Design a protein around this ligand. Sequence first.
Ligand SMILES: Nc1nccc(-c2ccccc2)n1
Ligand SMILES: Nc1nccc(-c2ccccc2)n1
Length: 158
Amino acid sequence: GAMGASRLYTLVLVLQPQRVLLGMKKRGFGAGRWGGFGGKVQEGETIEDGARRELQEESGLTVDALHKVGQIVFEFVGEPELMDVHVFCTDSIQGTPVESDEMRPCWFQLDQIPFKDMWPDDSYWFPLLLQKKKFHGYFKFQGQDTILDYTLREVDTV
Ligand SMILES: Nc1nccc(-c2ccccc2)n1
Ligand SMILES: Nc1nccc(-c2ccccc2)n1
């Protein structure tokens, strides 16, 4: 039948030549994992404005200019609504990251990407992000650890 309805999310990676900024989620769904900064797009908000807003709210960083790098759809067994995540990256920042109620930030060298403490799907698409290759992906999860199905492709245009 019809593909499930999806909720629009953004996800932002601050990716510099030698390091990436990640936030450890302090509470809720996915708590205890390092990831990018993101959340739900609000009514009337452009996707990129939502991405900038999520970065500011969760990390304190203000950036003008994000680059679209990928789209990932997440599905969780037992929940009919999908997560439609638009992924962005920026290399140029001009402030300091701060701990927020949602996220605790640390910088990671790019030979120390903390995959063991990141969502399992990141092992597949994060390498494409690091190579500056655009991608579309889909991951079906049983709970937070187990992938039952996934698709992934490199694209020329997101
Ligand atoms: N906590 C939780 N657990 C399972 C699924 C979801 C979900 C959220 C937004 C959109 C689609 C699914 N959220
Ligand atoms: N990379 C990835 N994979 C699956 C789910 C998530 C997620 C993280 C925080 C909040 C909601 C979903 N992130």
